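TODO from last week: model LP1413 - SCCmec type IV-encoded DNA binding protein.
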Amino acid sequence: MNKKSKQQEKLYNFIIAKSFQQPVGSTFTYGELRKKYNVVCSTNDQREVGRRFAYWIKYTPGLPFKIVGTKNGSLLYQKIGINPC
């Protein structure tokens, strides 16, 4: 919608790109990707992006990711292969 937080858009755009850059087979959590973000942001902005990410990945079809378990109380994702055959 029209109104939005510039700060969360930036962190989210980064998390998305960083997830796609994961090599095939690698496992990761949101917090592992978040800690590689160079800019400081509030805990509030971290958790909002975390949840927008957790639902993007779980309900957007055709993404090269799946859930494989948990790690340190967070969901554990895995980058999977994109190009069968």
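Done. Strands lie at 27-28, 65-71, 74-79.
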